[PDB]
Amino acid sequence: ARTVVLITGCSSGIGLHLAVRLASDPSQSFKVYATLRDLKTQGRLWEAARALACPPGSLETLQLDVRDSKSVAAARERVTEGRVDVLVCNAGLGLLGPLEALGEDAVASVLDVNVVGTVRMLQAFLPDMKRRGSGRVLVTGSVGGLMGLPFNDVYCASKFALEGLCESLAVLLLPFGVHLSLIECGPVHTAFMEKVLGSPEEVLDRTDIHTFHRFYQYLAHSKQVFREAAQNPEEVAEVFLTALRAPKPTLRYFTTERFLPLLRMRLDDPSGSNYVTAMHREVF
Amino acid sequence: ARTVVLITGCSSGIGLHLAVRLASDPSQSFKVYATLRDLKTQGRLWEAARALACPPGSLETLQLDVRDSKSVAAARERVTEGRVDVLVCNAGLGLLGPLEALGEDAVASVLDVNVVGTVRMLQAFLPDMKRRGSGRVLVTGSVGGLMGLPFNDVYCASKFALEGLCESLAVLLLPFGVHLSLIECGPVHTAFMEKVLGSPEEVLDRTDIHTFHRFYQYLAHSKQVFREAAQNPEEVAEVFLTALRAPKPTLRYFTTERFLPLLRMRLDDPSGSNYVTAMHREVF
Ligand SMILES: C[C@]12CC[C@H](O)CC1=CC[C@@H]1[C@@H]2CC[C@]2(C)C(=O)CC[C@@H]12
Ligand SMILES: C[C@]12CC[C@H](O)CC1=CC[C@@H]1[C@@H]2CC[C@]2(C)C(=O)CC[C@@H]12
């Protein structure tokens, strides 16, 4: 009927805001398929959809576990239009804490969901976009996929991974007509974000007293950055729209130019010592 | 007794050459624990060890599956000295082909071995190095972890991941005394390398005729680069030694400056369009 968009991880954050922003667009040219792991959490999405008065039939919810390829396939078929014009790979997972204190299953989960998950999506929907000779894929990144952050080893690993995966495809898709873009977000006003950060005893028993004291220092400094730089999801969700409408999209979109200074000096010295020292001071 | 080194994935390539290079060092100051997934492949290592006349007791082989944490633990205990001074995380896995043609288990395997595997190693040996206040960790990288390469989506994903994981730890380890370094290798004279590349029908039935024709073009161009830039493992294995002896090691060591030009222009334009076009031409 009109631009068919499918978004993953819509139970909150960028995903939820992006879905309603699309569905409630005045032009009414978007049909949105919001995906969620557990449906019992679709409440907030629907409540937000009523707040913005989304016309009936512009928003549909599907249960989709990106950790499972059978659920990825079952979903693709629930797509009545029989076509996907815009795939937004947003499902993500975070992990904070010193490496040694992280469980093995947790580390495997973050990579399975964040990296293998978007690969599974790309596999089930990419072929068709190549046949057509047209398609758009949006992947939500982070500045943590452009530079390493202490205590975010595995999170950064998964996001750094997305940069490599996407940068590789882009080289090959250029002549196929389907465009791929990464949306590099900095912190994004998530009240829950600054509440997850705060793990005293549980962490303290799996690490030494000096790593723990540094963790505290990281938490302290991060909550300061969050409160002084976090942007509104509407500002971020609108960058996706800018990427979505560019006639010839670039590979990377930055929601903010704030962290660009730090990224520069990391590209100025390929050996990485300047960045490692610079970043160590702005956190310790 | 003397610098205790433990290396992973020693059945061939960098791993095997590095192990004997260490063990057979004239100073005799290195005790080497070469690790392998399957012991039935330790032949080449021993044969190479005799060729360089490694003194008895300077080289020991251990079976270690980095895909399993119980095997990682059992190994750490087989370390008689009760200490590891240099951990070299070398176990790696490659994957070539268009995304849609790759199996799901294969993609999961490459990340489990390449990324989660080195995380498991870091978890079992990092704490002790922090207690001591001294330690050295060497991780073998690739230029494919610094820039995306067509048809190497998942391989680059895993190597890009190592850059993020390591860059993150380095920020936190700086004041602990344990150093971490990545050894960025370009192609390395592996006869088997240019033989793996060559998948006609099997690939052709899981992808379209235009992606397949491009694959052929990639294979063709890559074998040209391999034959005109691949370096000797002794040249590469010696970079590890340079990193190992620097009083204050940097975070990144490049075995060659050849691919540095391309890396520069990728750091000159953060949006990534210049790189994507530049790389598309030098391969198509
Ligand atoms: C590392 C950095 C940015 C640099 C600051 O000094 C510390 C910091 C805290 C929280 C991080 C953020 C980068 C963007 C992150 C990763 C998100 O994507 C959520 C909270 C975020
Ligand atoms: C992408 C690139 C380097 C750029 C060339 O145009 C194409 C090419 C072929 C083989 C790749 C290599 C980078 C280094 C790699 C990844 C290895 O690590 C083994 C063979 C290698």
Torsion, Cα of A203, A205, A211, A213 (10° steps): 80
Interface residue A211 vs chain B (CB under 8 A): yes
- Atom 15, ligand 1: which residue's CA is nearest? A187
B167 in Cβ contact with A148 (< 8 Å): yes
- Judge: A275–B115 Cβ closer than 8 Å, yes or no: no
Tokens 């499918």: give the residue: A6
Structural Rg of chain A based on CA atoms: 19
Interface residue A154 vs chain B (CB under 8 A): yes
> Who among A127, A151, A272 is closest to B251 (CB)?
A272
The upper half-sphere exposure of residue B237, i.e. CA atoms within 13 Å in the direction of its Cβ, equals 20
Residue A115 burial (CB count, 10 A): 27
Residue B1 CA, distance from chain mean position = 28
Q: Which DSSP helix (H) or strand (E) runs through B146?
A: none
Method used for this model?
A: X-ray
DSSP state string for B19-59: HHHHHT-TT---EEEEEES-GGG-HHHHHHHHHTTPPTTSE
Burial B218-242 (b: 16+ CB within 10 A, else e): bbeebbeebeeebbebeebbebbee
> Can you tell me the distance from the alpha carbon of B153 to that of B207, in angstroms, rounded to the nearest whole number?
15
The upper half-sphere exposure of residue A213, i.e. CA atoms within 13 Å in the direction of its Cβ, equals 5
- Atom 1, ligand 2: which residue's CA is nearest? B149
A263 in Cβ contact with B270 (< 8 Å): yes
| CA closest to A146 among chain B residues | B164
For chain A, domain boundaries:
1-284
Q: Which DSSP helix (H) or strand (E) runs through B245?
A: helix B233-245
A272 in Cβ contact with B167 (< 8 Å): yes
Tokens 């009545």: give the residue: A80
Which is nearest to A72 in space by CA: A119, A110, A137? A119
Query: Does residue B53 come out as left (phi exceeding 0), alpha (psi in the -120 to 50 range) or beta?
Result: left
Q: B237 in helix, strand or coil?
A: helix
Q: What's the DSSP call for residue A143?
A: G
Strands laid side by side in the A178-185 sheet: A59-63, A31-36, A4-7, A86-89, A135-142, A178-185, A252-254
- Quick one: which atom of ligand 2 is closest to the CA of B222? 9
Torsion, Cα of A182, B225, B151, B205 (10° steps): 160
Residue A281 CA, distance from chain mean position = 27
Q: Mutation test of ligand 2: which of B12, B225, B283 has the most ligand atoms closer than 8 Å to its C-beta?
A: B225
Burial of B71 (0-12, 13-18, 19+ CB in 10 A): middle
Interface residue A274 vs chain B (CB under 8 A): no
> Can you tell me the distance from the alpha carbon of A113 to that of B111, in angstroms, rounded to the nearest whole number?
12
Residues 6+ apart with CB under 8 A from A196: A94, A96
B171 in Cβ contact with A279 (< 8 Å): yes
Pairing mode of beta strands B86-89, B4-7: parallel
Contacts of A275 in chain B (CB under 8 A): 167, 251
> Can you tell me the distance from the alpha carbon of B5 to that of A64, in angstroms, rounded to the nearest whole number?
46
> Can you tell me the distance from the alpha carbon of A114 to that of B167, in angstroms, rounded to the nearest whole number?
19
A23 token code pair: 């569905």
A246-265 residues touching B, CB cutoff 8 A: 250-254, 260, 263
Q: Which superfamily, per CATH, for A1-284?
A: NAD(P)-binding Rossmann-like Domain (3.40.50.720)
Distances (CA, A) of B260 to A157, B184, B220: 23, 11, 22
Residues 6+ apart with CB under 8 A from A24: A49, A52, A53, A54, A55, A58
Distances (CA, A) of B41 to B12, B35, B196: 9, 11, 19
Burial A265-277 (b: 16+ CB within 10 A, else e): ebbebbebbebbe
Interface residue A278 vs chain B (CB under 8 A): no
B66 is in an annotated binding site: no
B11 in Cβ contact with B42 (< 8 Å): yes
B24 in Cβ contact with B58 (< 8 Å): yes
A66 token code pair: 């990106």
Q: What's the DSSP call for residue B116?
A: I
> Can you tell me the distance from the alpha carbon of A226 to that of B3, in angstroms, rounded to the nearest whole number?
44
A275 token code pair: 């960045």
Q: What is the number of helices (H) and of strands (E) in chain B?
A: 12, 7
Residues β-bridged to residue B31 = B4
- Judge: B157–A165 Cβ closer than 8 Å, yes or no: yes
Residues β-bridged to residue B4 = B31
Stated resolution in angstroms:
2.3
> Can you tell me the distance from the alpha carbon of B182 to that of B50, in angstroms, rounded to the nearest whole number?
29
Burial A211-228 (b: 16+ CB within 10 A, else e): bbebbeebbeebbeebee
What 3 state SS string does A226-243 have? HHHHCECHHHHHHHHHHH
A265 in Cβ contact with A275 (< 8 Å): yes
A125 in Cβ contact with A84 (< 8 Å): yes
Residue B246 burial (CB count, 10 A): 13
> Can you tell me the distance from the alpha carbon of B86 to that of A121, in angstroms, rounded to the nearest whole number?
40
- List pocket residues of ligand 2, CB cut-off 6 Å: B 142-144, 149, 186-187, 193, 221-222, 225, 282-283
Distances (CA, A) of B264 to A33, A182, A277, B150, B258: 40, 20, 21, 19, 11
- Judge: B147–A160 Cβ closer than 8 Å, yes or no: no
Torsion, Cα of A139, A140, A143, A147 (10° steps): -40
- Judge: A102–B123 Cβ closer than 8 Å, yes or no: yes
> Can you tell me the distance from the alpha carbon of A159 to that of B181, in angstroms, rounded to the nearest whole number?
20
Q: Where are the beta strands (DSSP E) in B133-235?
A: 135-142, 178-185
> Can you tell me the distance from the alpha carbon of A183 to that of A89, in angstroms, rounded to the nearest whole number?
10
Which is nearest to A149 in space by CA: A270, A265, A282, A14? A282
B164 in Cβ contact with A154 (< 8 Å): no
